[PDB]
Structure formats: structure tokens, C-alpha cells
Design a protein around this ligand. Structure first.
Ligand SMILES: CCCN1CC[C@H](CSc2ccc([C@@H]3c4ccc(O)cc4CC4(CC4)N3C(=O)c3ccccc3)cc2)C1
Ligand SMILES: CCCN1CC[C@H](CSc2ccc([C@@H]3c4ccc(O)cc4CC4(CC4)N3C(=O)c3ccccc3)cc2)C1
Lengths: 208, 218
């Protein structure tokens, strides 16, 4: 799994992207959307190179720690080309006045930062994979997979013609946004208080 | 226009002192810890004013950054002081606690010990530590802030890019390959995500310096 080249890493992550779901009272709608997204997030996670080499127990615990950050970065990515709004679904585009908002504004600020940086889709899927592997790690294989996502990000920035200086500056800019995504997830849990159970996540993993 | 070497030296020179507790009971512990944190906050203000680029910001923005970052900064300082003492948190040289020494305190205690362990595994260097602490100051509040606010953010990101350049410089100096430099840069910056996590958890557990207090010292 660690033998993939950088381009093969990118290709695998792009191929594993989950579909964009539609909405089926605001907060029942958004909860139900999140619930349906979580199954597709599990299928995605199983395709992040290195993830399924962990025990099922450690897979579940990484998902327990990461699932809200992953929903949020996906939302921010979708909303990136809709200034001042959040595209929860293609049939569910909300502005902040429908938000009444503190967390809404943080998400909008993240999407605008992504817009400023002209975040690329190949960079997005790497960041999402880092969240998966990193959010639960504090609580050797995981670190080896994280290092090769770093190698892959740097490879993408070199391919785009950035200087070596610009590469490390951009790498750092992107990883600092992950601190803000963590902050939003923490404030989001406080607001939503919700957590998918160990057994629910385990069932969606569909063990052999 | 500071070089990386000048950035490192300025940050090392700005380091606050390690403070002591007064010269044990569980019942007085939180009072001692709060008194220590209060005294450290005064020195943290002086340190912040010496982080290159910080005092170029408006007073209002300086307060907002410190408002967002002060707990993360106390926490990373504690983890650094604790790094050579496995299983312990060295709040002060005369206040060294283990995890057996309040509801929800041990959960945060454990996250801090895990950060200390991570520092040891990576053999974190003092020059890297001071860079990380300056990044926290400039970054933690930069997504929760007019033409003046756009100029401020620009400056903050230019200072952050300089610190990235400085970290890479330090790592290259230590003989790391270029792959190893990027890998370690990422490893260090991902630690900042965990420090943010502990700050949010800590705020929940502690429930704070006022703007006027921060403005008065600033
Ligand atoms: C078994 C039941 C457990 N399920 C139920 C709990 C657990 C799910 S709870 C839950 C999770 C997510 C949301 C949505 C939602 C939905 C889809 C998506 O892609 C993103 C978001 C973003 C956001 C999380 C911040 N959100 C809000 O509503 C929000 C947005 C901006 C400001 C404030 C609140 C809503 C509810 C799993
Ligand atoms: C008038 C403004 C009020 N002042 C404004 C600053 C003051 C704010 S409150 C406050 C801040 C800090 C702590 C200490 C403390 C002290 C010094 C230090 O270097 C680090 C720490 C770490 C830690 C914060 C997590 N802590 C705990 O006790 C703790 C530790 C592990 C698990 C759980 C709790 C304690 C209280 C109050």
C-alpha cells in the first residue's frame, strides 16, 4: 500500500471520492443528510491507501474522531464557488440569514480561504485523507501513510510549477487550515449537542 | 527582512521565563494553577510583542489573536517543559504532577501527556518549539476576524510564511533530506491541530482574560 507512486496515490484518492447526495424542519433535513453521507464516507475511507491495513477497532476509532471534520471539509469544498452560502446539497443552498450562525460563519470563512488559495481538487482529497488518519491518532503505520500523503501534496505542487519555497509555504498554509477545521468540529459538536456509535460505524464497514 | 537565522534568534531571545509556584493538597491545586497561569499571561504579552511582525498589527487585532491563542500557548509551553519528564506535567519546577493527581481533568491531562510523548518521539528542538508557538499566536484567530482587515491578514500570512521558511531552514541545517524536511514540517504542523483540540476541550473544562485586560497589558 505504501508502494504506490505519488500519481497513483492521487489517482486512487480521486477515484474513491463519495457521491454528492441530495436532501430528502431544517435540522431534521441536515441530520438526515449527514446520516446518509456517513455510509459513503465509510466506503471512501476503506479506499484511502493504508486505512484497511489497520484493525477494524482502530478504523472505527479514526472514523469516530474524524467524521465531523470530514463532513465539514466536504461542505466547504462544495460551497467554495458559492460565496456567502453553504451548498449542503444541490437542492439545499443556504445563506447565513437562513442560519439564524457562529459556525455558519466559520464554514464560510474556510470556503473563502480555500477560494483565495485556489485549492485544487487533488489537494482537497489529500487533506481529507490526512484528517481521517490524523484526527484520532493522539487519542507507525498511520504515520507512514501520513508521510506519503505529505510527499504526494509536495509532488502536486511541484507538478503545478511552484518553487521549492512556494511548495513548503503552501503545504504549511494547507495544514494550518486543518487546525481551523478541528476547531470548527469541536465547536460544531458543542452546538449539535449525535455521535455515531462504534457499532453503527462497524456495521457500515461491512467486515469480512 | 529578517533572515531565518535572525528570526530564530529573535524568537529565542523573546522566550518568557519559567515561573514557579509558591513555596500539597488536591483542594488547593486549582488555585495554585490559576495563580501560575495568571502570572504567565503577563509574560506572554511581553513575548507576543517581540514576535516579529506582531506589533505591526492594530491593537484590536493583537487582542483578538491573543484572545484566540492564549490557552494553546500555555498548553504548548507546559508540554515543552514536560517533554523530558515522562508521565508527568511540569506546571512549574516545584509543581510536577502525575495523572492520579476534578471531573474531566484526567482526560485533558492525558491529552497533554500524549503531546509530550509525541514531542519526545520526534526529538523536538527548542528552535522548532519557539517557531510553533509563534505560529499558534498568528494563526489561531486569523479565521475569526474592511480594507484594513485585508491588509492585516495579508501581513499575518506573510509572517506565517516567513516562519515556515525558518522551520525549513532549521531542518535543513540539521542535515535532513528535502523529503525529510517536508515530512517533518507536516508532522509538526499537524501537532498544532491537536493543540487546538486540547484548547477547545480545556475551555469546556475550565468553564478567561477579558479584552480590556488583554488591551491593558497590550
Ligand atoms: C445515528 C444518528 C447520528 N447521526 C446524527 C448525528 C450525526 C449527524 S448530526 C449533524 C451533522 C451535520 C449536520 C450539518 C451538516 C450536514 C451535512 C453535511 O455534509 C455537512 C453539515 C455541516 C454541519 C455540521 C456543521 N451541519 C449543520 O447543520 C450546521 C451547519 C452550520 C452551522 C451549524 C450547524 C447536522 C447534523 C450521526
Ligand atoms: C482574570 C483572568 C483569569 N485568569 C486568566 C488566565 C487564567 C485562566 S484559567 C486556567 C488556566 C490554566 C490552568 C492550568 C495551567 C496553568 C499553567 C500552565 O502553564 C498550563 C496550564 C495547563 C492547564 C490549562 C490546562 N491547566 C489546568 O489546570 C489543567 C491541566 C490539565 C488538565 C486540566 C486542567 C488552569 C486555569 C484566569
Amino acid at each position: 500500500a505504501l508502494s504506490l507512486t505519488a500519481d497513483q496515490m492521487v489517482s486512487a484518492l480521486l477515484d474513491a471520492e463519495p457521491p454528492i447526495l441530495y436532501s430528502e424542519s431544517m435540522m431534521g433535513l441536515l441530520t438526515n443528510l449527514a446520516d446518509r453521507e456517513l455510509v459513503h464516507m465509510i466506503n471512501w475511507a476503506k479506499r484511502v491507501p493504508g486505512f484497511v491495513d489497520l484493525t477494524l477497532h482502530d478504523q472505527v476509532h479514526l472514523l469516530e474522531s474524524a467524521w465531523l471534520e470530514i463532513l465539514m471539509i466536504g461542505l466547504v469544498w462544495r460551497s467554495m464557488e458559492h460565496p456567502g452560502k453553504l451548498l449542503f446539497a444541490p437542492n439545499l443552498l443556504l445563506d447565513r440569514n437562513q442560519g439564524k450562525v457562529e459556525i455558519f460563519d466559520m464554514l464560510l470563512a474556510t470556503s473563502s480561504r480555500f477560494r483565495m488559495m485556489n485549492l485544487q481538487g487533488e489537494e482537497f482529497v489529500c487533506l481529507k485523507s490526512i484528517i481521517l488518519l490524523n484526527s484520532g491518532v493522539y487519542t507507525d503505520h498511520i504515520h507512514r501513510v501520513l508521510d506519503k500523503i505529505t510527499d504526494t501534496l509536495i509532488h502536486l505542487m511541484a507538478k503545478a510549477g511552484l518553487t521549492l519555497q512556494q511548495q513548503h509555504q503552501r503545504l504549511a498554509q494547507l495544514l494550518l487550515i486543518l487546525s481551523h477545521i478541528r476547531h470548527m468540529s469541536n465547536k460544531g459538536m458543542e452546538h449539535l449537542y449525535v455521535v455515531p456509535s462504534y457499532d453503527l460505524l462497524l456495521e457500515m464497514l461491512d467486515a469480512h
